Amino acid sequence: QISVRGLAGVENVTELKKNFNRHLHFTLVKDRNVATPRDYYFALAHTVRDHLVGRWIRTQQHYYEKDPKRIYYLSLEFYMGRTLQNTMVNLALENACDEATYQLGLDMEELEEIEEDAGLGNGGLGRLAACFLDSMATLGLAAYGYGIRYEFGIFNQKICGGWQMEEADDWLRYGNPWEKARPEFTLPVHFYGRVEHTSQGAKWVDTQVVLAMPYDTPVPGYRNNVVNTMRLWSAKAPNDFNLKDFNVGGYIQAVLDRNLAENISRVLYPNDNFFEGKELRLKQEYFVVAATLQDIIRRFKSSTNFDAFPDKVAIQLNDTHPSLAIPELMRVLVDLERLDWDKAWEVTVKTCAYTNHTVIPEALERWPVHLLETLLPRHLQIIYEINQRFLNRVAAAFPGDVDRLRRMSLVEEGAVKRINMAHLCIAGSHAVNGVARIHSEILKKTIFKDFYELEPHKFQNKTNGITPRRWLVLCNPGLAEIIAERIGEEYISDLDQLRKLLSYVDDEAFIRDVAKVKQENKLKFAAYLEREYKVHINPNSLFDVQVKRIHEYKRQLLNCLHVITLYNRIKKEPNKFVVPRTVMIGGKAAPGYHMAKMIIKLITAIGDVVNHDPVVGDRLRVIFLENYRVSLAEKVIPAADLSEQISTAGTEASGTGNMKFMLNGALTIGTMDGANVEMAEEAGEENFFIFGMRVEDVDRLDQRGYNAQEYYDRIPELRQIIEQLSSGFFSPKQPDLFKDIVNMLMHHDRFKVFADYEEYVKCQERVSALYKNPREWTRMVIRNIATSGKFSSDRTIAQYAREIWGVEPSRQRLPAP
Amino acid sequence: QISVRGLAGVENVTELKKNFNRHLHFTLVKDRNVATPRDYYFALAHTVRDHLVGRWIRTQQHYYEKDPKRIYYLSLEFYMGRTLQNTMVNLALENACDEATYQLGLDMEELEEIEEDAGLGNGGLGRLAACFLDSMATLGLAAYGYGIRYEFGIFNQKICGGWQMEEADDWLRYGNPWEKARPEFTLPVHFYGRVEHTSQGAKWVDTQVVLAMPYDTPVPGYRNNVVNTMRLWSAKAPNDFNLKDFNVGGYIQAVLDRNLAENISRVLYPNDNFFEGKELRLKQEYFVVAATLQDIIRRFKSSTNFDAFPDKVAIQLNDTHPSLAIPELMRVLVDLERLDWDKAWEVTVKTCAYTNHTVIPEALERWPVHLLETLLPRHLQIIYEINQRFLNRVAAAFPGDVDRLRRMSLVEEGAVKRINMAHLCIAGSHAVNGVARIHSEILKKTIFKDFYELEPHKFQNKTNGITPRRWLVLCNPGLAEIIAERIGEEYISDLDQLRKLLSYVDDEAFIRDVAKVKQENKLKFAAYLEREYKVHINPNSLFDVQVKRIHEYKRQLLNCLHVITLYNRIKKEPNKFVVPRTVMIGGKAAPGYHMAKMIIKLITAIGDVVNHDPVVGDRLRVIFLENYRVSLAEKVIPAADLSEQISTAGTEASGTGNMKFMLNGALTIGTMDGANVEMAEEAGEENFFIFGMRVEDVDRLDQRGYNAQEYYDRIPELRQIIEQLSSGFFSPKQPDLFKDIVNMLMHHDRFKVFADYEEYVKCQERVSALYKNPREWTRMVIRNIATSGKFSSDRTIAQYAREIWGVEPSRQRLPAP
Ligand SMILES: *Cc1c(COP(=O)(O)O)cnc(C)c1O
Ligand SMILES: *Cc1c(COP(=O)(O)O)cnc(C)c1O
Ligand SMILES: CC(=O)N[C@@H]1O[C@H](CO)[C@@H](O)[C@H](O)[C@H]1O
Ligand SMILES: CC(=O)N[C@@H]1O[C@H](CO)[C@@H](O)[C@H](O)[C@H]1O
């Protein structure tokens, strides 16, 4: 039992064992003779859950009594992962439960592996929302996460014949012990219908009604007894009209068709940085917004002058997905509360804040007018009015600038009329932020330049972060322990204290412990790999890892080119020494993203060749990590030596995986993109492996005109690789299998893979040179870990609180349980 | 607190209050400040449930140890109603819980009204299965009820403008504390596909797979610590093929289409005594049978010579709904276990028993061959083989009788080929029974005459019954108490002891108590009527009740004719004295049964006229009891004076509502149909109000030819009624509203309403004459209650056990909890 895992004191262990047996009997209705590992997992989950309830109830009672300003984080994604260990960590019950289960003859770590991941997110955006919820609770903010309870989260990825196969993530199959259904708080949501203009105001009538049933999940802060709530809405059909609309096609059919309204919360769209304008997605977006706003207003009216609304409520929009909150708030205030437009607008603007997460054009939401027209007629009218008044403001500030007017319009003209949701968000929010310094600057200099010129005060930066609880203490206890031994435990909730480790960079003892922990993590992971999936990696090789969603801008393809280069160099000089490497690439491709699926096949195709070449031996291995998800991230990241963050400069808004690797003892090879810039700034550029074009360089190349052929003609090693791909060297039975990839690299590569190839290969050689010197590699690692403090989501949330929401974070512990 | 409700002893009450608060806090996550009545209901339900778990686990462990013969009751319907009070009654916790909640400042009776009915049945057939489960547990049989967990049970009936409106019964909305999901025991069910004949046997391949997930509900016996199980299957789509069948229409659509396989357990077909040959119904029937048989075999292989199978297993088929169990058992034994046909057939016949519940032709299941052909190709082949071998047996016993062969064939020739499931059941079962003596005789003399001649030994009778726990102790505690005061509590599990009450028929004290209880029940119900539904009945009037499903054979129309007769007689002689009556009619009509819906409208239309006629006053009231269901039956039956059981002789197989009224102190007016015959036999015909044609009389009339016109021409009062209906007297704004009803009564009444009119009216006059003499009315009531013992489902189950299943019932209490 390690120090940071809490105390396992007599009374506690005895009490836990007692309650464990209680739940196994009464809750699961089983006895020790027929109980399976899953039964034991659930008995433990219910036992831990019990310790959470008391504090959950008083935290909420507390907010009712003190009535502080409330923060509502709206997101269509919350990538939570597993909850058991995280709950134990935050409640300081890990060692007690470990002992209690040990005495019951059970291995707690094998029980934890039974829990299903709550994968209600695609990647970075969804996981950021999860880290934020943790930090808001740890900082004592009266915050509520609001989203959708998808019955099917991100699909489980299977690799068959080297190809990605998708299968439904039935995560609720065995039940979810963490959520609490609150059917009593069900709210109605309206769709379709038409607008009627009456004597006093407009009325939205003849609508289809769908019920929103909330499920609450507790979010515990770190050892402060604060337990906030994440409320997820589930779609339910009403019992009437969805059957009472008589004169029709039969009783049975009417009941079966209920699964037409309930499909709204059925599944998560599996896209990462890609907009898909489907009606079902729009319905989901309005569903979460409509239900949430009614809940917010209801809670407020308990706290009718809405002038104080902005003082008691803050609504944060995670991307444009929940952008309809702006016109919906206006609708309720104008149509239902009967406030004058101007007054309602003032309240709305002061209440909403918008966070932008990307500059990629194919990721921006632009909804066709005909869709909004049919599904939400009243909102479309409100949007037109907002646009009209906004453009009048622009025209007054920039007289005669007619092109500026069309550029800033919320309504985009063309083949099909569309509403630019990003423009909607900027107009209706008092604050707009990017997620990394370089991203926020790009927003002001390019994409939102016109808006910045009109309202410079709205634009801000809030560099992303990750929670040190899940991403250090939970997944890397070994490291957290050796750190605690030197500087105490205070850093867990004050990551900046990791800087104290700088005075240990020359400590022979510490250097040895740091390296020891990494080695243990690698052996641990190397074992998991065989135990599950039967694979052959060598724990002595350099663990080169690139895990994140598969996307062309992420450039998994550049990594592939390097891997093939290494392979060719070995075959050319077989008996020459090279630092052994285990290259691991993992990530999911969106089901309808062809090129992404082709990239996965190439990676496995390369492994098929490299992993079975006698001459290579155990000097180079290429493994594709199947079903990359939060729980897998918690295993591979602590075991990594090299972190690949190689997106084309200017494409990765921030990145968060980069921060996770830095905190866990891996060195980083990457481009000056997103948060990589600030990470290098914090650690010192001489302690980072930076390469490739900077944003300025990419722009030059575009002015010039990118011609991949040039690089192909002047770089022999690159030419060889392309010829191997084209000739079928990696696909014997299908010679032209990778023709699309080659065609893209050569004629229409929007991300300039070839442009950074030479610089990349050279930088990688420097990485291999340092790995040869264990002591110096580890000292550089220490300098990275020691300067990763700025990337704690606690820092990020404290900035949102003070600069956007107008609330003060607190580390004060709540009056016990 | 009344005696029969158990003890409320210090330690128990203290413990219950403690656990109540425990669940309210930890389970519901609420505190006394925000808890609603529903929250309190759930805290109490979980508290009572806890006392059930211990015994449930040891009962099952007990069956595993002693390995007795097991009884499997297969039914597509289980009309359970509410579970809270029933559980308390059977565990002897009613007074303790009453006191415990009282001390917590809560009214337990108002909490009980919050529980939703588990309406997984249509009427008599489904409720019989529920009473049987109770009796099997009370008699210590190792029995399991197997059915389907419909997410939508029988629709909730609303009356709008006098018409029936249907709305979805979302009974699981707030959760079900009584069931326990057992996802670990999920089993696959196959559909479609094709048959392949290989070297060694036939193979069913290329099928669609649907998963069957079981949910277990505890069934406690009466104070014997026995807790049996009712396992209900829920449909689940697999995560693969229902997504892995690549090369198709999109990821999102594939996930949404999962609600194509899961629709199997979505809703209960709302038909009572009416066959609807839809594919979805056939899928439900096979779904329950396939999942159940695999579960049975699996449990057996734990108990490979299947020769002992019939000694360890008994399968009871409730009607033909689960008839596919016969060919499915053969399929598994022949195709999977590789037993020779003859051996497999011997086992199947000795294992299965069939109970027939009706002789109405439109209720008999006859599935089109093309349906079975496409959905279950292997089963169709097995059915043909069974038929072939059965007909060879018939041909050998009755040489040259070619018409007998076509009459007995399982395959029905004609416009469309169909399989007669009843013939299938008789051929593949070792016992076939009717549900009342007269019904069982009709089966042998008519419908199944040919089969009886071939195998006389298979035909039996098992008169239906009702459980005295729910239908006396639970719904009429007042009566159970005054009975217990005189003869003890032993009768609750030995109803025959009620005969001792015969020696109290002249007891002035008892006569007074009996009448007092009825009066209290009527006041109680008269109040409920106003509290809910705002209505005006008078507690001093005779409560004339007819509650059951609306159907032409049940003759609610004959009752209507009498009601109109009374009304007309009053209008003719306003100032003449007549015994005051409150006529109550209630019941649901199947959504697609036009005539049934028209009958409901007529009843309310009559009330509209009669209830607002100044001259009538409070002498006659016509009320339509909305949403008749089990919970409503528990309220109205104890309050009834007159029970209407007036089906056309030979149409009501047994009836069970008739038994409920008899046990609760109501006199009966009825035809010699179903169990009415045996009830009159037991009580003495001079203590029953019998009228109308007997079965023999109906047959004569059919030989003759039924001509309604004759009765219309010779009965002035009847003529007047028909003319009032035709002229629009009961539908002013729609003069011909009831044209269909009149047309039917006059030209195509299959149930001869007019033929029994005169006899009915006269009998009703005799009922009014006796009601005028309180003392004599009550003495006759006592003679009915005292002779209702034979109708306890404990008697019924004991007979099934000894004469069909080959097992001995036991009243021995299980070794405590
Ligand atoms: C942290 C995380 C991400 C984000 O990784 P990036 O490299 O920033 O894209 C994606 N998926 C999972 C499961 C994560 O844990
Ligand atoms: C007992 C019962 C029935 C059966 O009544 P019959 O008059 O035999 O048709 C039908 N419905 C409910 C809810 C019952 O309690
Ligand atoms: C649309 C979307 O998911 N954008 C992503 O948001 C996360 C969290 O801010 C960033 O780290 C990532 O670089 C950016 O691509
Ligand atoms: C098909 C069907 O529901 N038949 C019914 O079965 C119940 C229970 O046996 C009988 O009481 C009733 O008279 C009979 O009509």
Swiss-Prot record, chains A, B:
The record marks 144 as: Can be labeled by an AMP analog. InterPro entries: Glycg_phsphrylas, Glyco_trans_35, Pyridoxal_P_attach_site. This is Glycogen phosphorylase, muscle form. It holds the Pfam family Phosphorylase. GO terms for cellular component: skeletal muscle myofibril. The gene is PYGM. It comes from Oryctolagus cuniculus. PROSITE patterns: PHOSPHORYLASE. CDD domains: GT35_Glycogen_Phosphorylase. NCBIfam families: P_ylase. The record marks 97, 131 as: Involved in the association of subunits. Allosteric enzyme that catalyzes the rate-limiting step in glycogen catabolism, the phosphorolytic cleavage of glycogen to produce glucose-1-phosphate, and plays a central role in maintaining cellular and organismal glucose homeostasis.
